Structure formats: C-alpha cells, structure tokens
Design a protein around this ligand. Structure first.
Ligand SMILES: [Zn+2]
Ligand SMILES: [Zn+2]
Ligand SMILES: [Zn+2]
Ligand SMILES: [Zn+2]
Lengths: 553, 199, 53, 305, 198, 199
RNA sequence: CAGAACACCUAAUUUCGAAUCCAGCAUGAGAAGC
C-alpha cells in the first residue's frame, strides 16, 4: 500500500506515498540537486495526486524541498514535522527561493507559496501519537540533524517505520542511539548509506584555516568541536544563515542531547554579521580559524575569503563535508594545504543501520531500501539478507497484516430499546500488538521537572491569574505548546521566563499591584516553577486544571 | 427531446465567501469552535445552493423588464406555471427543465476555508462590544457546477448567462451586504444528445 | 448514571434554591416577554438539563 | 487465514468441509506421498518436505506446516511467511533459525499451556512474534491509556451494538443521545386529553358554515390537508381541535405570519386578515356540532376525510 | 425599477492598518509581525466598509436629532424603522445598500510594508517595548462598488456624508494615532436592473 | 455628542529634526546610503508620530502636578481608564476621544530631507574615529496635524496646548538630547458640529 | 551526500469570541391485464 515516487536517487523529486484507503499519507517529499528537469518534477507532483498529509522527517532539501510545490498544486492538506524542522524549513525555503531567483532558473514555487505552506503547517515533537484518519502517527529521534525524526505510522493494515536519515556516533549535539517504536514494526523503510586531524592542522596553520561546512548540522558540530577543545587562537562564523541556525539550535537546545539540555557553545565564537565585517575578516591577516557555511565553495560568503586563503602558502582548507559533482569545492579537493575529514558525517554507515534494525523489538517483515548510491545499497541489501530479512530495492520492485478487534465477551444477553441491539458491559480494552476487549475476570487473572502538589498548582495559577501574570492568552498558548508535546512547552516556558541581559525584560505579563522588583521577580519564579510542575502532569489533568481559569483551551 | 443543454459553470471567488451550515448535527458540532460555520460536505468540500440564486436573479431581472413572472419568494407562494422561470426552474405542476447542481468546490476545506473574527464596534467609546468567529471561503477558490437543461430553447443559455452576471453583480450567498460573495463566472456549455450513453 | 459513574470510579480503582411552581412559570413568562429567556436559550437549557443536573 | 487445520486460499485442510486434505505423520482429494518430496503440485503451489512439511505458496502468503520434529529436518530454501509449529525445545529453535528468510509470524499448536508459553517467550527473545490459539467485524468508536503489568490498558464500561454488518463499541454519549431521541419520540405521542370527554366557543349557523368553508376552499386557505388534519384533530376530542386551530391561527410576534395557507387572489392585507379570522371563527363554530354532522360538512370538500 | 451604483475609490494619505481577522493567517504571521494587516489569498488588501459607513451615519444622524438606532451597543437589536435600518439593514429586512470590501488595486508587496513601533518610558526616555506591524503605504488605491437595490433620492447624499465622515475620522484601526486618514472619489450612476438581459 | 473639537496644529521647526524610518523595506533600501533614514511617506513627505509625544508630555506634567495618572511608558503597562489622559488619548477598553493625526509635512522630500555626516572623535587624540551619514529635516519646515476630539470637555484644549508647550521645550522626534527636534506650534481651534456633512 | 551573502539593543503583551427570529404549506390516493 506504499508507492515510492522517485525513490531511487532522490533527484528531480522523491516521495513515499503510503495510501491506506482513507488517507494518502506522504513521507519525505523533497528534491536532491545534481549541480529542464523542473518540468519532470512538475509532472511527478501532479502524478502524486491529493495527499492528505505531508509528514516530514528532517529539514534537509532531500526530504523537505517540494513542500510549497505540493502547496502550489494544492495537493497537501496538512504539513507536520518537529518545530526545529519547521523553522529550519523556513530558513531552507527562503534561501532556496533566493537561490532560484539569483541563478535565474524559473522559480519552482514562490515566497507566498512558502508562507501558505506555513499556513497549514502543524507540528509535534517526538513520542506524540496522533490519531489521523485511523492511522496513529508517532515521531522518534533518528540523530541525523536537530529535529530529525523517524516516522511510525500504525494503519489497520500494518505498522510502517519510515526511518529517514540515521545519525552516526560522531554526531555530538544529539543522542547517538536513534529512538525506535516500542511496538511491532511490520515494514521498515530504511535509507541506505552514501576529528583530531582538524585541530592539529589548525595548529600547523595558525601558529605557523578555512573550513567549508554545511549550515545544518555540520557547521554547528565543527563549532561545538572547537568549543570543547579550547586551544589558543579564536573562531569566527562568517555565515549569515549558519549564524541563524546556530542561534536556533541554542533556542532548540531542549531538542538536543540530554547533557546539552542545561550557554551551550561557552562564548568565544565571534560571528560576522554584515558583509563589511566579512571583508575585514577576509583582509584580516591575523592567525584565526574561520568556520563558515557555503557548501562546496560555489556561492555564499566563503568566497570573500577564498582568494585570500587560496594563494596563502601557510593557510589550509578543511573539507569536513562531501563535495558533489561539478562544484568548485570538488575542483579544489581533487587538485584541478588540502585536507578532507570523513568523521564529520551526519549519515550513518552500514553497521549502524544493522544496529538500527537489530534493536527493533521484532524483526521486520520487509526492509525497503530506498535512497543512497547503488552499490552501497546492493551490499547493504546482501547484509540484510544475511540477517534473514526481506529486501525490496526500488529497481527490483505480500501478505496482509490486519489488526483485528475481537469482542471476547458474551453477546447472548442483548436487548432492544431504539431498534438497537445494545447491551451494557464493563470490561477492559487490552491492546496487544489485535485490540482485545476482555471482561473483569480476565483482569483478575492478570492481577528534570520540579514537582508540586495539585492544590499548590491550583492556588498558584489562581494567584498569578488574579495578579495578571498568567493570562487567558498565556494559558491558551501554553496549552497549544503542551498539546504539541512536553519539550515544546518546556521551550516555550523557558523562553518566556528568560531574562534578556541587554534590557532586563522577561516575556511574562507584568503584575498588577504595588509589588517591588524583588516581589515581581519572586512572582516570575513562582510562575516558572508552577508551570514546569504543570508540564510534569498528565495531559487530561492539565486540561482539567487549565479549563477552570481559561474556559476555552 | 433528442438534445440536452449542458452548461459547465466555473466560479472563481473574488471576495470572501460565506454560506452557513444547514445540517443541525454538523452546525451544533461546530458551534463550540465557530459561531458561523460554512456549509460543508462530508467529503470536506464546500457546497453552495445554486438553483435559488439563479431563480431569484432571473425573477428580479424579468420582473424589472416587465414580463409576467411570478414571485415564489413570498410566503408559501405558488408558481403559476406560465413564466419563463417556471419553464426553466420549475412549477408546482411540472418540474423544471434546468437541473442546477450544488456548487461543489475543487478543493478541500483545509485549503480554502479559514476561520475569521468579526466584531461590533460601539459608536461612542470605539470598543469591542461583541465578538464572533465565523468561517469563510478564501478568494481565488474555484467552484464547479453543471446546469442541465432537458428541453433546450433558444433563450435558455442567454437567461442563465444573464442570471450569472446578476449573481456576479450582487453576490452568490451569505453576507452579501458586508461584501461577501462577490465572485466571477466562466461558462462552457454544450448541447449533448440524450441518447449519448447508449452506444 | 449513579450506577455508571459507580463502575467508572470502581473499575478505575481496580487498575439549589427553592421557587414555587407558580413563581417559575410567571418569571419565565415575564422574561420571555422581554426576551431575556429566548427560544434558543430555553432549548439550550433543555439540552444541558437532559445531560444531567 | 487458518482456523484451529483449515487454511482457506478452496479451504485446503492440512491434516470442516469442501477441502483438499493433506495428511501428516510423526474432502474432494487426498494429497500425500501421489507426490513425493521435492515435487510441486497445483490446486496455490503445494510442495511436501520430509520430517524426521506442507509448503503452500499462495497469492498472498507462503504457509509452512511443519508437523512433528524428531535428527536433522528438511526445510524449504525459498520464502516463508507463516510457520505453523507444534510444541510438546532447542530442536524447534534451530529448525526455525537454520531456515532462510525467517517467517513473519509463527503459530504454536498441540501442547499444554506451560510448554507453549516457555517456547513463546523463547521466540519473542529471538525477535519473532508468536500467536497462541485456543463473524461480524468490530469497531471501536472510543478515544487515554495505561501500562499495568506490561499491558496497555483502558478502564472502559460501555455498550456493544449489533447491526447486520458490524458490531460497534459506544460510550455513554451515544446512549444519552438515543435516550433523548426516544424520550422526545415518547412525549410527542400523547396530548393530555386525546380521545376523552367532550369539552366557550362562537356559534354560527350551518348554512353560513357551508358558505364560509366553500369560499375558503375556492381560494386556497382551507385546503384538503387542512380539512384532513382538522378532522384528525377533531377525532381526538374537542380540546385537541381547540389547540390545533389556536396553533394554526397563531400570529407569531416576531414575524407576523400565521400557519394558514395564503389566499389565491388580489386581496389586500386587511381583507387577508379578515379571511384568516373568518376561517378561525368558521372552524370554531364547526367544532360545536356532532361528529356525524361535521363529517357530512367535510365530506363534500375532502372525500377521504 | 432602478438600482444605484456608487463606484468609490480610496486614496490613502496617512498609513493604513486593518488587522488580519483570519486565525490561520494570523498565527502563520504572528512569528514575523505582531500586527498583520488584512490580506486576501490573492495577495490584495481587504478593508471592511459596511460597518464604518453605518457607524458614520449612525453617529451623525444621532447627533442631528433623528430617531436612529444604535447598533454599536452590545447585542443591540436594530429598530427596522430608521434611515440606517433602511439603508444598511435590520433584523427583519435586509439592507438596500450592499457595500463591498475595499479591494486594493495593488499587491501586498507593492503597498504593504512592515513597520516597527515603540513604547518609551516617560522618565527614562528609553525604548521599553518594541513591536512590528504591517501597514499600507500612502497613495495606495482601493475600490468599492456600493450597490443600492431600491433607491430613494437621499441615499447617495447619505453615502457621501458618511464618506466625508470617514475622511474626517478614518478607516481601519489605530485611528487615534493618526492611521487611516484617507480620501474618497465618488462616481454615481443609476442602472436598470434588467440591463444584463439579452 | 452633538459637538466635536478641531485643533489644527501647525509646527514650525527651529532645530534640525530626526525621526527614524520604521518600514523595514524602506530601511533596507536606505541603509546602503543613509544609515539613519527619516520616517518618510510613500507620497515623499516627512511623517512624525504625534500621538504618544502628547501622551508622554501630559503624563509627565500630570504626574508632576499630582493627578492620579497612570504611566503607560513602563513595559506592557495597562492604562487605568480613570485619569484624564486615559479619556483623552486612550484606555485599554474605552478609546481615546482625542484622535491625533500624524504630522504630515506640506513640502516634499527633496526640499526638506537632507543628508548629514555625524562623527565620534577619539577625544584625547582629537582624531576622527567614527563617521556615519545620517539624514534629517531642515529648519523652517512646516508640518500640519489635526486633532479631533469626539466628546469634548472644558479641560481638553488647555491640556493639549500644555502638552505642546512641553514638546516645544524638550523637542519632538528622535535625538532630543543632542539638540534635535526643537519646534514651535501654532494652534487654531474650532468647535465643529458632529452633523456638518449630512446637509 | 548538499544550498549559499560605522555598528548595536529591542520586534513583546492583553481583552472579547457572543446574541436573536423562523422551521411552514399545497397537490395527487387511481387504473388495467391475468
Ligand atoms: Zn539528510
Ligand atoms: Zn409562474
Ligand atoms: Zn434603526
Ligand atoms: Zn489612566
């Protein structure tokens, strides 16, 4: 029941359409660039048809590049990802559209299209199951980039795990072990494969660099690698969108590795903001390390420093990312100092994918290898077959898995009231991996956040509502961020309570009364601790607490 | 007869558009979120009544021209059966030749229907006295219908087109006084044979 | 309902002013004449009263 | 599917009715070793394998019935989807493990509870799911979960409803809705004094009633449905006809309309109101007479009633 | 039977702000601007026009000493007998003057910019609060085609008086800060309501 | 009411005046050349926010005299609704009776808007360190505003004139500390009827 | 294994999301074969 729309090389369009009868759920609607094909992309999106939802795994263009184009032909109803993926998609779509206007290629979608994609853009974080058109959808972290998820869709005809891109051990800002469904996985759609050296050549260039990174993941991991090792010389970020992504991962640090959920980059990262500071740092002859994101030396800011760095016989150029075909970066890496680092790789190797399949609870019925290069997909598929699991490659491309519901109780004692065969029963809806109703005799056969009491939460929210610090708008926004999930509400409450060091203002509503600063700050800390203790509670309990003060949501 | 007239009518919405929900269960399920729901399908599209708008338009213009056209808008009024609109849309004796469809949209509710907020500004004090949220259909939304005339005459396409220009002038449904429902129409008719499907 | 909520707290565990009837109809008639108690209001109060006290 | 073995797609029986039985060791046709091992038969490609196993390749699913295992067994080298295995312990393990393309779901059969449970736990620790066996489709229309004793549980008491095609599970909101609907249907069945003792009326002559009823039958105020419901409300008593004519003649204060059908003619507003009160007074004088007299009044305008 | 067409054309003289009412377009736009402007899905600018016209005529006719109802009071029932109920509507009868939204002649990117407004402490003289709102530039042209179904002689004069009151006071929001000071051009014509018949 | 108050305000500036541009697109089209762009109209005239300066002026004076005025300059401060500045300029529920128009300039951009270069010297070395090319309105420029009071009271024109005598003393616009914005006001008042356009 | 371009500091917050009318008529109740 799943169609791989261009799921071989991901160029000129790629998509995973899981049609389940009542829903045309769509996964990984993105574009890969090779660097006239746009018409074939257009024909493929018109070939997709009406999709009820455009699930998004991660914020790269491979999975998120055709979302406003599906909005343009109006084929998608709802677009859901993580909030980190949503704002990184904002930066991606704006930069991609600016690149389409700069290169004079006919624009695929429009800026208004990007906006109207964000009209219908819902968001949830990990481990938040949503019941959409009898499909239960859950997100899990797969350690690729920030906000990157693997999708777990339970339909009545089976459980599908769209893995997306899987992270490696060398990813420092995230947990290494990718989160998995705790239940049965029937079909697993897996995408195949495709540090001290950097520091020591930074010594042999500085005391005697230029680093081309990628703005999502790669530049922030180079920055964090330089943050852990404090050497002697300084680091500069000469990249606008890389600086915005760095600031957002500082904002979205609750979505990161658990150790890094407590600043993060411990200062000392002078970021160049405008192009005049860029020309200054290009003409600066001081020994310093310049990390910046253009990609493969083809367009961006890097090119302000390239000339200065290129002719310099003391400088070096540190390729921490893959260089694709027909790019200036590839033309300088092959030869037509030069160092290439292979540890800075967001994509997992083959053995990490074997680890990913092996720590499933059950062995999947069929592993659908989709993207990656051909020969690596071939050898990976052979190693899946050596683990006795079925493989369907997209070039080569069937039981039926029905999740039945059984009554398991007596139905003889039934009556009629309104031409209905109704009977009252008290039982237990046990849920195996075959929802089962079972009577009470079966049950007898079987049988970071602070913490506050419920009455203290009630009295503190009532006090701060009378003091006007907590508001109906505040409770409504907190309920929206809490229905998003716990971590999004943690980020919202931390963002409200955080005191701006330049101005001394918190985003809390000011108290109404004759309170002196100290009392105002103690009331703000009371609101912070009270709503974190509310965050620790259950969702229905939070709804029953917040419906007293704000009658709607 | 041996020929039938098919008028494919395409509507592009130019102003905001509202047509209120008529199903009591769906309206009562929507009053916990919006005070004015849009008349919507169970397949999540938007339908607009279209026969009454065309009949009202044609009756107003033909009464203005001076023709002997009845007013079936008065309370429990009966059509006489001799008017041109009685021949087209219907009478109590015989059914009408024109079979007007609902205006089903080409897009689903999550793509064309938005939830908006209207107020009641007090004349002095300039404050929000009342505030109500209502659903509406955006501008640029495309609706489709097929008007099916069983026994075509020479003046059936012309009167339908004149009624469509009157609906463009005055609005199709809902809050026509506040500026809602100002739309535009494309017409592609074709006289099809009645025995077409037999083959 | 007193039975049902009974099991709805049991199984989960295992895992007013006075007015005369003449005064009420007189007051409802008076408020209906000045349109405080509308038909819409009496209907919604009836549906809310059918769901319990 | 397999019912505890009958495996439809047909209804082939492996070791009931309308079947192609395949006996094991250790209807319309009986297939056994004629076809020996390593040879395939059609019916759904069926191949038998020696035990010391029936292999049906269908359109959807490749089923394997093992039989009793004693010694190295013999297993197919193709693709297995279901593995029906007896359990009465390490021999079954490697019989599973040494087979390529390990099956989607295995089935345990022909044993007690403890041995089947121990083997089942050993197969979940090998990461292969098990099923332990011992019709209208059922629909949960419910919506909170629990995790007591490693089962996902929900305390729910509700109703089961049985239609001709499905059995649904509903909560108290459905029962409240149908109870309110049936209460509204029950209360709309009676009026307080229907068909009871005969109950402050204007009086008018029979000829004037004939004249007025004929005049309001020519123009469309007193019509055939009006006379029909008037006679039906007159049959259930005098006060019921009083209530019906007061409901029909009632002018709404918000709209200024009554439930009479408007006259067909060129009458102005005052004359239309005079005709409405003429109809009200004429029918009020008509409720005075006896039932046979009113029937003789109204048969000349509505022959049905 | 005749009908009256009043083609009005607004030129904006002081910057115009009408807030966006659509909840989706609001929450999509409340991460970039704190005060979105009312916008079509076809990227034009929307202004309500019937309420401002009715408010202008209600204030002025109440000041003149006429027996007009105040429909601005909360849950106010219009009388159905006054001039404003005849023109704009009552609970029994619909209004004769069907008044359209003020569709701008230009797209958002040509007439709509994003301004930043402040809130400054009176003692400190420092910018305490900052916010951003969308506003319509000056010289932007809006249009409407006010249609009167059953016209009398005085309705065009009342519409022009209401338009002069809008030029006095303002349309849209933020009127006390100086927003919405506009000018109107009126072209009036009586049209037969059988004129599309061919 | 039956009565409104018109206050025609003519501002003759005496010092150079600066009010920074607020529109983001018109600032990015400017900060290549003018890094402090003047708040300008799209009809190339100079715009000054006039409300708020009056409200800050009257709040400072009325706090000095001792009236029970709330200060709306604190962060997210809610107006009380009881003091005379809340009645004049605005409360959070009742709107302000005094609607204060912007200070439009009568002359176009090319005749008043001028580019200046301000500096920052190293002090002890007496050598220029920073150089930035701002933009400002010249002196003798005439600005116009119209303050409309809907329900006038007797203590309305005097309070507005007092607030303008404050704004003359400390300046309007930006950079009031270094000597920008020193202005003078000519006030012509006229009590006009609320029903003067009807007939 | 992918997008990339004189200086700051700020770009937050709140309140409303309701009320009312209407839910009626009219016509047809028969033929014919077996
Ligand atoms: Zn990726
Ligand atoms: Zn007729
Ligand atoms: Zn009135
Ligand atoms: Zn105050």
């Amino acid at each position: 029941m799943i169609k791989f729309i261009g799921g071989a090389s991901k160029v000129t369009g790629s998509a995973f359409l899981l049609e389940t009868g009542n829903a045309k759920i769509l996964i990984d609607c993105g574009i890969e660039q090779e660097k006239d094909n746009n018409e074939i992309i257009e024909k493929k999106i018109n070939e997709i048809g009406k999709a009820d939802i455009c699930i998004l795994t991660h914020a790269h263009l491979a999975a998120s590049g055709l979302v406003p184009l599906l909005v343009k032909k109006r084929k998608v109803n709802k677009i859901i990802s993580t909030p980190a993926t949503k704002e990184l998609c904002r930066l991606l779509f704006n930069d991609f559209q600016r690149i389409q206007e700069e290169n004079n290629d006919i624009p695929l979608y429009s800026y208004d299209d990007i906006e109207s994609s964000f009209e219908i853009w819902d968001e949830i974080d990990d481990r938040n199951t949503i019941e959409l058109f009898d499909t239960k959808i859950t997100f899990y972290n797969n350690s690729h980039i920030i906000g990157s998820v693997s999708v777990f869709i339970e339909t009545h005809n089976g459980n599908y795990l769209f893995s997306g891109d899987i992270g490696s051990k060398l990813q420092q800002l995230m947990d290494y072990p990718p989160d998995m469904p705790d239940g049965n996985v029937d079909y697993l759609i897996l995408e195949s494969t495709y540090r001290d050296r950097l520091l020591e050549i930074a010594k042999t260039t500085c005391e005697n660099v230029l680093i081309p990174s990628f703005a999502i993941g790669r530049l922030q991991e180079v920055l964090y690698t330089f943050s852990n090792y404090n050497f002697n010389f300084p680091v500069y970020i000469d990249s606008p969108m890389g600086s915005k992504v760095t600031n957002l991962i500082k904002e979205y640090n609750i979505y990161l590795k658990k150790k890094l959920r407590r600043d993060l980059f411990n200062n000392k990262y002078i970021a160049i903001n405008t192009s005049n500071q860029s020309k200054e740092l290009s003409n600066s002859k001081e020994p310093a390390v310049i990390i910046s994101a253009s990609g493969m030396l083809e367009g961006g800011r890097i090119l302000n420093h390239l000339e200065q760095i290129k002719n310099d016989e003391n400088s070096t150029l540190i390729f921490v990312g893959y260089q694709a075909q027909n790019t200036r970066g590839r033309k300088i890496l092959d030869g037509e100092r030069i160092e290439k680092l292979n540890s800075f790789s967001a994509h997992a190797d083959q053995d990490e994918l074997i680890d990913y399949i092996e720590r499933l609870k059950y062995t999947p019925y069929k592993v659908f290898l989709v993207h990656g290069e051909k020969e690596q997909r071939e050898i990976l598929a052979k190693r899946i077959i050596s683990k006795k699991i079925r493989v369907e490659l997209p070039e080569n491309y069937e039981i039926l898995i029905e999740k039945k519901v059984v009554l398991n109780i007596n139905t003889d004692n039934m009556c009629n009231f309104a031409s209905y065969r109704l009977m009252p029963f008290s039982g237990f809806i046990v849920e195996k991996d075959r929802i089962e109703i079972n009577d009470k005799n079966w049950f007898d056969m079987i049988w970071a956040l602070p913490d506050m009491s419920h009455d203290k939460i009630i009295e503190n929210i009532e006090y701060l509502f009378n003091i006007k610090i907590l508001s109906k708008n505040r409770i409504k926004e907190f309920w929206e961020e809490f229905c998003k999930g716990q971590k999004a509400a943690i980020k919202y409450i931390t963002q409200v309570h955080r005191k701006n060091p330049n101005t001394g203002r918190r985003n809390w509503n000011p108290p109404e009364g004759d309170f002196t600063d100290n009392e105002i700050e103690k009331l703000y800390e009371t609101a912070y601790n009270t709503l974190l203790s509310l965050i620790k509670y259950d969702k229905n309990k939070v709804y029953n607490i917040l419906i007293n003060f704000n009658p709607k949501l | 007869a041996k020929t039938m007239k098919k008028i494919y009518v395409t509507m592009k919405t130019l102003s905001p558009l509202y047509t209120g929900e008529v199903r009591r269960e769906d309206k009562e399920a929507a009053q916990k979120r919006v005070n004015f729901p849009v008349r919507k399908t169970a397949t999540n599209k938007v339908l607009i009544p279209f026969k009454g708008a065309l009949r009202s338009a044609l009756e107003i213009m033909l009464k203005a021209k001076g023709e002997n056209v009845c007013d079936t808008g008065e309370s429990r009024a009966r059509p006489c059966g001799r008017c041109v609109t009685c021949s087209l849309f219907g009478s109590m004796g015989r059914a009408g030749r024109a079979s007007v469809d609902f205006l089903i949209s080409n897009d689903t509710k999550e793509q064309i229907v938005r939830e908006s907020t209207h107020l009641r500004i007090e004349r002095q004090t300039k404050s929000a006295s009342d505030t109500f949220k209502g659903e509406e259909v955006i501008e640029g939304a495309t609706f489709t219908a097929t008007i099916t005339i069983s026994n075509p005459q020479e003046k059936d396409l012309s009167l339908i087109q004149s009624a469509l220009k009157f609906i463009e002038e005055n609005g199709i449904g809902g809050w026509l006084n506040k500026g809602y429902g100002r739309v535009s129409f494309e017409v592609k008719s074709e006289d099809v044979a009645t025995d077409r499907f037999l083959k | 309902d007193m039975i049902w909520n009974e099991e709805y707290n049991k199984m989960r565990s295992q895992i007013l002013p006075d007015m005369s009837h003449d005064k009420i109809i007189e007051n409802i008639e008076y408020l209906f004449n000045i349109k405080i108690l509308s038909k819409n209001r009496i209907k919604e109060f009836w549906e809310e009263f059918c769901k319990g006290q």
